[PDB]
Amino acid sequence: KETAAAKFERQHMDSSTSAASSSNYCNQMMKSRNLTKDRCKPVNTFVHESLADVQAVCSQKNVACKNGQTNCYQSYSTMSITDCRETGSSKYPNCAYKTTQANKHIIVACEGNPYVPVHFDASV
């Protein structure tokens, strides 16, 4: 069954582009990464950096997750990210999203050995 680490890459990593290139980026990515299979995931962030740079966040600034957990880490540097948010016209199975480009610090939750990201918590 898919591991938590593999699930993080599938839902959040897009090293193949430096940023979202059109307003349809989220619509395409959400569907292809299988994030709209059972329902429309309401919000999802993609990170446009190398996997190694994102995995490195687990050894950066330790911070509390939004939920209180203390296995969260924030990147020392800003990263290129795309914020995908469901629109008013979104209706399963035709999930629709608004694409927003941004450069922010990311906060992820890390677990395992090797200690890698398993959940995207927020961008600040």
UniProtKB/Swiss-Prot annotation:
Coiled coil: none
Single Gene Ontology MF annotation: RNA nuclease activity
Keywords of the record: Disulfide bond, Endonuclease, Glycation, Glycoprotein, Hydrolase, Lyase, Nuclease, Secreted, Signal
Cystine bridges: C26-C84, C40-C95, C58-C110, C65-C72
Keyword check for Ion transport: no
Subunit record text: Interacts with and forms tight 1:1 complexes with RNH1. Dimerization of two such complexes may occur. Interaction with RNH1 inhibits this protein. Monomer.
Family: Belongs to the pancreatic ribonuclease family.
Catalysed conversion reaction: an [RNA] containing cytidine + H2O = an [RNA]-3'-cytidine-3'-phosphate + a 5'-hydroxy-ribonucleotide-3'-[RNA]; an [RNA] containing uridine + H2O = an [RNA]-3'-uridine-3'-phosphate + a 5'-hydroxy-ribonucleotide-3'-[RNA]
Disulfide bond recorded as keyword: yes
EC number: 4.6.1.18
Protein name: Ribonuclease pancreatic
Entry comment describing in which tissues the protein is expressed: Pancreas.
Subcellular location field: Secreted
Residue positions binding substrate: K7, R10, K41, P42, V43, N44, T45, K66, R85
Job description of the protein: Endonuclease that catalyzes the cleavage of RNA on the 3' side of pyrimidine nucleotides. Acts on single-stranded and double-stranded RNA.
Superkingdom: Eukaryota
One CC-aspect GO term: extracellular region
Organism: Bos taurus
Active site as annotated: H12 (proton acceptor), H119 (proton donor)
Glycosylation sites: K1, K7, N34, K37, K41
Primary site of residence: secreted
Enzymatic class: lyase
Any one Gene Ontology BP term: defense response to Gram-positive bacterium
